[PDB]
Amino acid sequence: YEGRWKTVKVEIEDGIAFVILNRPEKRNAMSPTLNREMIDVLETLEQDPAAGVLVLTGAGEAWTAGMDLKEYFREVDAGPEILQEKIRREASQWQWKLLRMYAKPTIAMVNGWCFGGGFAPLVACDLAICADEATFGLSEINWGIPPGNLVSKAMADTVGHRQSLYYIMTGKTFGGQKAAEMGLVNESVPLAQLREVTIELARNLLEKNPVVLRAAKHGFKRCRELTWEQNEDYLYAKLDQSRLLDT
Amino acid sequence: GRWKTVKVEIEDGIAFVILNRPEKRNAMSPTLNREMIDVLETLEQDPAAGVLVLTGAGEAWTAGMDLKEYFREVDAGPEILQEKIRREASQWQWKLLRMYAKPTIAMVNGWCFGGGFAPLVACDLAICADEATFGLSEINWGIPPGNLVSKAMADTVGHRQSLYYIMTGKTFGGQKAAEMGLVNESVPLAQLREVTIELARNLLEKNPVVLRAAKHGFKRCRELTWEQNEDYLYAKLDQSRLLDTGGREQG
Amino acid sequence: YEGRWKTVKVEIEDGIAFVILNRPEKRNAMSPTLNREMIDVLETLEQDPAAGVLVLTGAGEAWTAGMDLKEAGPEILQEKIRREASQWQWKLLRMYAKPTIAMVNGWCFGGGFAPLVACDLAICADEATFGLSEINWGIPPGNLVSKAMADTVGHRQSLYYIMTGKTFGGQKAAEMGLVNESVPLAQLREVTIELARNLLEKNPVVLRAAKHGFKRCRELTWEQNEDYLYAKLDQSRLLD
Amino acid sequence: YEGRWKTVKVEIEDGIAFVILNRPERRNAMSPTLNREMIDVLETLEQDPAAGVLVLTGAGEAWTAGMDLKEYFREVDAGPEILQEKIRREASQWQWKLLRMYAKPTIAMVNGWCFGGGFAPLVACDLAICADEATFGLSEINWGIPPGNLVSKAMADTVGHRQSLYYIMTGKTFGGQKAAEMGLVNESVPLAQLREVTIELARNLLEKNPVVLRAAKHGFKRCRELTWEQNEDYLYAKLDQSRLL
Amino acid sequence: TYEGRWKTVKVEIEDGIAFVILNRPEKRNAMSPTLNREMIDVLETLEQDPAAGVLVLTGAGEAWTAGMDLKEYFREVGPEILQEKIRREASQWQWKLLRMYAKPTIAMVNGWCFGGGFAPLVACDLAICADEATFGLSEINYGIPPGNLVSKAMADTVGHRQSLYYIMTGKTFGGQKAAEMGLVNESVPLAQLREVTIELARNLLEKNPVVLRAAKHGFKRCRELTWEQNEDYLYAKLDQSRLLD
Amino acid sequence: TYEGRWKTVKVEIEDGIAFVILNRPEKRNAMSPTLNREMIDVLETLEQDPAAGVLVLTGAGEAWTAGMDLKEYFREVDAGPEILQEKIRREASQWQWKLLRMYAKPTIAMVNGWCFGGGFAPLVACDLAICADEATFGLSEINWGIPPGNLVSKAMADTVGHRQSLYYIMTGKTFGGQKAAEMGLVNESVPLAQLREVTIELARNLLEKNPVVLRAAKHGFKRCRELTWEQNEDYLYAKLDQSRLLD
Numbered sequence A: 001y002e003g004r005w006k007t008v009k010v011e012i013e014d015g016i017a018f019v020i021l022n023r024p025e026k027r028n029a030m031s032p033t034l035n036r037e038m039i040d041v042l043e044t045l046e047q048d049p050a051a052g053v054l055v056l057t058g059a060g061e062a063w064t065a066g067m068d069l070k071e072y073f074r075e076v077d078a079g080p081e082i083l084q085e086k087i088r089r090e091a092s093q094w095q096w097k098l099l100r101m102y103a104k105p106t107i108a109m110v111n112g113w114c115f116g117g118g119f120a121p122l123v124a125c126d127l128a129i130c131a132d133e134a135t136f137g138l139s140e141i142n143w144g145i146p147p148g149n150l151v152s153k154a155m156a157d158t159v160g161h162r163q164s165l166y167y168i169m170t171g172k173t174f175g176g177q178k179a180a181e182m183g184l185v186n187e188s189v190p191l192a193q194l195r196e197v198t199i200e201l202a203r204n205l206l207e208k209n210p211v212v213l214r215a216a217k218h219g220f221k222r223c224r225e226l227t228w229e230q231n232e233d234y235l236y237a238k239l240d241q242s243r244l245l246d247t
Numbered sequence B: 001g002r003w004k005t006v007k008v009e010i011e012d013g014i015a016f017v018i019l020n021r022p023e024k025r026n027a028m029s030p031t032l033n034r035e036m037i038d039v040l041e042t043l044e045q046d047p048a049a050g051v052l053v054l055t056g057a058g059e060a061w062t063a064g065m066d067l068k069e070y071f072r073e074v075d076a077g078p079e080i081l082q083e084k085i086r087r088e089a090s091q092w093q094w095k096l097l098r099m100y101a102k103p104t105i106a107m108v109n110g111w112c113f114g115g116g117f118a119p120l121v122a123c124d125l126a127i128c129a130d131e132a133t134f135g136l137s138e139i140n141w142g143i144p145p146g147n148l149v150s151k152a153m154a155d156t157v158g159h160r161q162s163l164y165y166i167m168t169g170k171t172f173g174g175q176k177a178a179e180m181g182l183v184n185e186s187v188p189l190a191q192l193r194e195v196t197i198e199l200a201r202n203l204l205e206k207n208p209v210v211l212r213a214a215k216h217g218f219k220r221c222r223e224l225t226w227e228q229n230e231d232y233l234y235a236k237l238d239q240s241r242l243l244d245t246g247g248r249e250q251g
Numbered sequence C: 001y002e003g004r005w006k007t008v009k010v011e012i013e014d015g016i017a018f019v020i021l022n023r024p025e026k027r028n029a030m031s032p033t034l035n036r037e038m039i040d041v042l043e044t045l046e047q048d049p050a051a052g053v054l055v056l057t058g059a060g061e062a063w064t065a066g067m068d069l070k071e072a073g074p075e076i077l078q079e080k081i082r083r084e085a086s087q088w089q090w091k092l093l094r095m096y097a098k099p100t101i102a103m104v105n106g107w108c109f110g111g112g113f114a115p116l117v118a119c120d121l122a123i124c125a126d127e128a129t130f131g132l133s134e135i136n137w138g139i140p141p142g143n144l145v146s147k148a149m150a151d152t153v154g155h156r157q158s159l160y161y162i163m164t165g166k167t168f169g170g171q172k173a174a175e176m177g178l179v180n181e182s183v184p185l186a187q188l189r190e191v192t193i194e195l196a197r198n199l200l201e202k203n204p205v206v207l208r209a210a211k212h213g214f215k216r217c218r219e220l221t222w223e224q225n226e227d228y229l230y231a232k233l234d235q236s237r238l239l240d
Numbered sequence D: 001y002e003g004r005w006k007t008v009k010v011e012i013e014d015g016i017a018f019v020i021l022n023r024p025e026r027r028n029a030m031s032p033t034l035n036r037e038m039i040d041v042l043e044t045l046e047q048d049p050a051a052g053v054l055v056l057t058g059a060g061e062a063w064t065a066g067m068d069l070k071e072y073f074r075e076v077d078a079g080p081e082i083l084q085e086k087i088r089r090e091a092s093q094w095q096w097k098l099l100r101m102y103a104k105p106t107i108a109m110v111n112g113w114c115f116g117g118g119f120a121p122l123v124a125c126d127l128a129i130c131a132d133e134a135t136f137g138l139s140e141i142n143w144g145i146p147p148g149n150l151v152s153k154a155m156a157d158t159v160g161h162r163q164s165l166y167y168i169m170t171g172k173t174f175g176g177q178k179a180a181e182m183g184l185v186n187e188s189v190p191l192a193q194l195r196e197v198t199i200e201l202a203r204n205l206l207e208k209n210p211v212v213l214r215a216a217k218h219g220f221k222r223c224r225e226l227t228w229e230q231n232e233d234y235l236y237a238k239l240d241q242s243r244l245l
Numbered sequence E: 001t002y003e004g005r006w007k008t009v010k011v012e013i014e015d016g017i018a019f020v021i022l023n024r025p026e027k028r029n030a031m032s033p034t035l036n037r038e039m040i041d042v043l044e045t046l047e048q049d050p051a052a053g054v055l056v057l058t059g060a061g062e063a064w065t066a067g068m069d070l071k072e073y074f075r076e077v078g079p080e081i082l083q084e085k086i087r088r089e090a091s092q093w094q095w096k097l098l099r100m101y102a103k104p105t106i107a108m109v110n111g112w113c114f115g116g117g118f119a120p121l122v123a124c125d126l127a128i129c130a131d132e133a134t135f136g137l138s139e140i141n142y143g144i145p146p147g148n149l150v151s152k153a154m155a156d157t158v159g160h161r162q163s164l165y166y167i168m169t170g171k172t173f174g175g176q177k178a179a180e181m182g183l184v185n186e187s188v189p190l191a192q193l194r195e196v197t198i199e200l201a202r203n204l205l206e207k208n209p210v211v212l213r214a215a216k217h218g219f220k221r222c223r224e225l226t227w228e229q230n231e232d233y234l235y236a237k238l239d240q241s242r243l244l245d
Numbered sequence F: 001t002y003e004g005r006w007k008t009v010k011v012e013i014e015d016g017i018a019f020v021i022l023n024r025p026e027k028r029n030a031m032s033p034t035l036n037r038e039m040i041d042v043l044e045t046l047e048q049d050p051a052a053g054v055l056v057l058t059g060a061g062e063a064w065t066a067g068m069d070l071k072e073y074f075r076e077v078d079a080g081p082e083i084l085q086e087k088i089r090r091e092a093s094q095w096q097w098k099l100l101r102m103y104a105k106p107t108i109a110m111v112n113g114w115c116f117g118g119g120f121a122p123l124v125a126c127d128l129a130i131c132a133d134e135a136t137f138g139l140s141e142i143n144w145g146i147p148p149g150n151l152v153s154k155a156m157a158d159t160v161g162h163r164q165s166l167y168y169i170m171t172g173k174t175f176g177g178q179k180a181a182e183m184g185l186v187n188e189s190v191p192l193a194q195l196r197e198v199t200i201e202l203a204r205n206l207l208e209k210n211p212v213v214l215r216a217a218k219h220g221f222k223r224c225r226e227l228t229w230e231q232n233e234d235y236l237y238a239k240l241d242q243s244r245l246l247d
């Protein structure tokens, strides 16, 4: 994995795969290059047995500062309209299509700045711990666009109706304690203890049968979309599928 | 003096829509309903108005549906009159209001009961007075919550707490309303107007069409799957770029 | 109702029907027998004018320690066994005719979460312990357990407790929104009763419309609900 | 109602309110005037006990040639955005917001051309009889737009998946017989028999209790959206609402 | 044997085919609450009976079912709460147990099918009728909208325009029209009804029962789910089938 | 030239029409994990290729497709790691409907022959379909001892009536091209000798449309099925306006 990707670094320690967004000089802004590389990282790590749990984090002071306004636009305008379709799909592909129902447990370790488009993979990640010192913001409004991709849904899934509208509509920033209070993350802790808390959580997840864990996490995310009567069918099916697959 | 039961004041781009039946604690009559439609429709076309703040005259925000004024009409006409009277209440309370073209803030200055919860939650954001008292009194009056009241709770207040207040009909204060997610914030009545106006000013700074796309998109995306939203939210983004004449000039 | 059921007791006092899960020796673990009796209990108390409100609680230290793992046959029996669990836990309970309160006096694990959340309201003891232990036993949550969490507990929290299987006490359950409130055990029965009596002062048909409407409206758009809620209100006025 | 509206006529006979789109010189294209008049028509006939069933039909050769290319699109598109959104909302308001769950039974009586945007109120009307000679078309694609407003959903509700995509994607026209065969309408008959057949259906409808008829038709259109288990609750509520009212 | 076991219903099993015979022919198999309760017991019993691999729901005499029993419902109902129970019992067998029943089910519609009979007709997986069978949603003419899951049964099997026509008019229709509309798989002469049904039952009996159950259930659920929801759901059913088989 | 490019598929473009030919006719175009991976590549490639205006999905030889490859797609995957199964299923879904159902360009299935089981997903993902009278269809899954996997049962639900769908799923009975057209599974059935001509005529019609506009129209229709009227008022107007932008 060393030197494999230009904009991401992967460090696998004893079952825990740290996936590190690695454009710290651009505050880990999500360029099309990065989107395409994160797709390869998630696919590759899915099939790597040494990666039992994934921790998504950022190099330097940012977690991610959102979409790369420059490189995204640079590539999009260099091509015909239909290029935008491909470029948008690639962002969705790693941010949540692969990530939201990922085969392996995932934890967002939010060490610093998290803006705009970063909310989608933040929520696609199963659980999330952040630094008190981290700063969040849905700054789309202040740039003259509504939240794009699945950002507004990420909010809708995790943060109350009123709170979600306040932050989307104002673009106002908030810290890690506020993010845990509003339910965006599981926990906010001082940055000095971020890695410790995250690793403790990752090892607790490593204790469980991966196939059983997958059945439980996926079934929970899906169940929110189904009625009780539909869930009776769906949730038992996931139960039974787990039993078949769990080996 | 355009409306009998509602006053509108526009200052620096903020339209204060003031429910104006204080003698009745701003209860919602069919007249009020009909006039609120006209108000929302009027203000929508008013380039001077960039944010709406929905508040009450006197001590109440609204004490809810005016039940005498409702029966006055419903029992003087055939069954089908009820259809029209309900459509009119819904029309301003949420059909126009929930997905309103312009940003909306409920400034809950006081009493908020019953049917008041629907326009409350229809309003995008809400700041109340600490001193405000809310309640879902419907149950003690012998009816389940009418109109969209129960959905308004569902959208903003946890399952357990929603059931509790619907089932018991117990009242709660602004702090507890903030706590449960019904409103954004609760502040002392003495600071309610200034707090709402600073929020309102923030919102006037935003591109209107873009704010519209953002707030509508959020409310609708709650109903859709992630994969349905991929399609819907990008559509709202692209629509916002077209309709905003405007410009989006970050870039 | 004395002596009527092997694994449950019903005790009615002045409109309040206490339904007491009664296998203390196995921490009120839910067996096929218990499931069948609970169906009978629910159907009976429905038609009994003496029960105005049901409070679902547990004998001894447990509320319920979840499905009974010991209490094998042809494949088709599993269909019936699963259906019987569902039938009382939420098919009858979630939209029950009468107001229901869970009184969580102690241990609440696994499959207990389903009737916990089907119960309309819930008060628990500070000393009670809850957990979604499924994961530690090697199954995801069965039946309606995960949806039960989805309805009451935030996304992050739900996933945390489901994925880790970590236990939490009464105060945390109230803070998460799992139950309405947590009181010391010493005051659980009194606080529960005060709530029950409050609900007993309502018109039952109206209360029913109100609590059914709210649970269903969560599933419907605002436009659907304009139709559905007014329908429930009018149905209420008919059934008076 | 004689001379009440500029672009629509209402002629009531024996409990049947014939609502006639009345711009035959513009093939009944739906302009902002017509849209606003149609709202007033719907609201008025709702409260008029003389009207027991509405028959939606068109003066001249057309049922409706769709939205007014000039007055609804071209003149508006250039004007204030906020007015555009209001104009769209007014089109919806009569075409389906009031019409799809209308208090009273509704029949579209499709005497001729039906294009584009006419498909929304077509499907909002409970039942529909067209003439064999009527021609239908989702011509939007050929005019450079996808179908606007609720037109696509009007198709989705009544015409199977492959046929809907076919007619939306090609914009090919189809006659009344094909319209009945695909499920867009209930029946197609020669134009010479259209009024008779439609009146006979209206008379059947007029024999039913209005409130019960409302509960049944509303309930059906809503139930398509709900699960069986949600429907147990909802449909029994509609039945009980019906008994109350 | 189940001979003489129930008052209003008969079960006769031949070679794995369980004929469930609605048996109040003097009352055209009207569904009283006694019949509803007995049907609950029948479904629960046949579920666990390995002799029964497929269930065929038919009616004694000239009716399949004339719908809900007017007299015996309106009788057994005061106190209000009793209606809750009676309505449940009706739903319990008609579709709560039946629609997602563990074994494959076939409606064999030999005659009259009205009103409330539509719920179990469509809960049954497949259906064959006689050309001579007559159907109608007479609820409108009795002054109630269709109750229970009747309107959804229609919504699942019959096109939008046709369902509204029949619901709003209450008009009757024969076996051939029932098949044309999609309400049943096939209409055949009465003399061929039993053997066609049996031929189909024999085909179903040849399948792996657990697999058949996954397949029929997953189809009916998938109608309610989006494609992305069904990727998850349908693989879960497949994998569940592989476990349980 | 796409000549020689993929092992198990061919692309031939004539005048804006990209014929995508499933090409294992000696295996009746059974869909192996190789063919699935390659079809993902084909669709991403053709999406960005302005020479391709409309895709026609068809089979070499006597088959359209005989369904998933029992040997390469089921048997051999079953012998592999569990986590591999996850990727294999995803890669089948990826070309069959995740890219294909809302594909950017118009699609037509040209069903020249056998179409079984797994075939039904990409059959209905394709916007339009013409088949030969001589083609034979079947949901054979039940007779191999599985329920329909992947999206097959949803493909049937979207296109074929409730009664007919259960009948064919439950019995496993085959049916011909005319009956496929009658049931709503395809748009039309013609003799095989005319299949190509009729398909190209349709494709030529489709190529006259503004692609961005055609895309909005077919996508909006598919999605509107899932939404209520009030929802569609929002969504369908968003599609119309997005179209006016990108157009």
Ligand SMILES: CC(=O)SCCNC(=O)CCNC(=O)[C@H](O)C(C)(C)COP(=O)(O)OP(=O)(O)OC[C@H]1O[C@@H](n2cnc3c(N)ncnc32)[C@H](O)[C@@H]1OP(=O)(O)O
Binding pocket: A025, A026, A027, A029, A030, A062, A065, A066, A067, A068, A069, A070, A113, A115, A116, A117, A118, A139, A140, A143, A148
């Ligand atoms: C669609 C959406 O995602 S909307 C969200 C878009 N992103 C944002 O609104 C956040 C934008 N960035 C910021 O607010 C600031 O960069 C912060 C708070 C993240 C960091 O502040 P600072 O520590 O003062 O660093 P600074 O602003 O100098 O940025 C460092 C470099 O990162 C670049 N950068 C930061 N964020 C982005 C971004 N989203 N896209 C592209 N470049 C970025 C900066 O332009 C700067 O470039 P340069 O020094 O090579 O010219």
Ligand SMILES: CC(=O)SCCNC(=O)CCNC(=O)[C@H](O)C(C)(C)COP(=O)(O)OP(=O)(O)OC[C@H]1O[C@@H](n2cnc3c(N)ncnc32)[C@H](O)[C@@H]1OP(=O)(O)O
Binding pocket: C025, C026, C027, C029, C065, C066, C067, C068, C069, C070, C107, C109, C110, C111, C112, C133, C134, C137, C142
């Ligand atoms: C499908 C689902 O519901 S997920 C499973 C959810 N439930 C659980 O994880 C709980 C399992 N049980 C426990 O963890 C413990 O019994 C506790 C914490 C509830 C209480 O523990 P203690 O106070 O130490 O008492 P203890 O464990 O000895 O319980 C005594 C009896 O209860 C029985 N019991 C408790 N829960 C269950 C159960 N869920 N199934 C079967 N038996 C149970 C024990 O087997 C034991 O039986 P015995 O006396 O014949 O040997």
Ligand SMILES: CC(=O)SCCNC(=O)CCNC(=O)[C@H](O)C(C)(C)COP(=O)(O)OP(=O)(O)OC[C@H]1O[C@@H](n2cnc3c(N)ncnc32)[C@H](O)[C@@H]1OP(=O)(O)O
Binding pocket: D025, D026, D027, D029, D030, D061, D062, D065, D066, D067, D068, D069, D070, D071, D113, D115, D116, D117, D118, D139, D140, D143, D147, D148
């Ligand atoms: C979303 C939408 O609704 S997109 C638009 C969809 N509508 C259509 O495609 C139909 C367009 N119209 C036509 O194709 C034809 O007019 C037909 C087939 C209906 C009738 O054809 P003809 O009998 O030959 O009449 P003709 O085309 O000359 O129209 C006669 C008058 O009606 C007008 N007219 C017809 N349709 C419309 C329309 N949709 N909007 C505005 N005016 C219309 C014509 O402009 C002409 O008026 P004018 O001479 O004052 O300019």
Ligand SMILES: CC(=O)SCCNC(=O)CCNC(=O)[C@H](O)C(C)(C)COP(=O)(O)OP(=O)(O)OC[C@H]1O[C@@H](n2cnc3c(N)ncnc32)[C@H](O)[C@@H]1OP(=O)(O)O
Binding pocket: E026, E027, E028, E030, E063, E066, E067, E068, E069, E070, E071, E112, E114, E115, E116, E117, E138, E139, E142, E147
């Ligand atoms: C809620 C719902 O399901 S809506 C009610 C649905 N049913 C209907 O609309 C039709 C009711 N019945 C009929 O129309 C006719 O009985 C038919 C067409 C089924 C058969 O007609 P006929 O063969 O001429 O027989 P007839 O009308 O004499 O009925 C025979 C007996 O069955 C009884 N019966 C038939 N249907 C019902 C019913 N739904 N409920 C109670 N009794 C019924 C009749 O009252 C009659 O009783 P009797 O001889 O003991 O006095």
Ligand SMILES: CC(=O)SCCNC(=O)CCNC(=O)[C@H](O)C(C)(C)COP(=O)(O)OP(=O)(O)OC[C@H]1O[C@@H](n2cnc3c(N)ncnc32)[C@H](O)[C@@H]1OP(=O)(O)O
Binding pocket: F026, F027, F028, F030, F063, F066, F067, F068, F069, F070, F071, F114, F116, F117, F118, F119, F140, F141, F144, F149
């Ligand atoms: C979920 C799913 O998709 S399960 C798969 C469902 N598919 C089916 O039920 C169809 C299976 N195939 C058949 O029934 C037949 O092969 C038919 C009707 C399509 C064509 O029959 P024929 O013309 O007699 O050709 P035949 O059966 O000899 O097939 C030719 C070769 O294709 C292979 N083949 C055909 N279908 C498949 C398939 N689905 N998977 C793997 N290999 C296949 C055969 O094994 C044979 O291989 P061989 O020559 O290497 O031994």
Ligand SMILES: COc1cc(C=O)ccc1O
Binding pocket: F068, F089, F092, F093, F096, F117, F118, F141, F147, F148, F149, F150, F151, F152
């Ligand atoms: C496209 O993948 C699959 C298709 C099928 C069709 O029956 C079954 C299992 C699968 O994995």
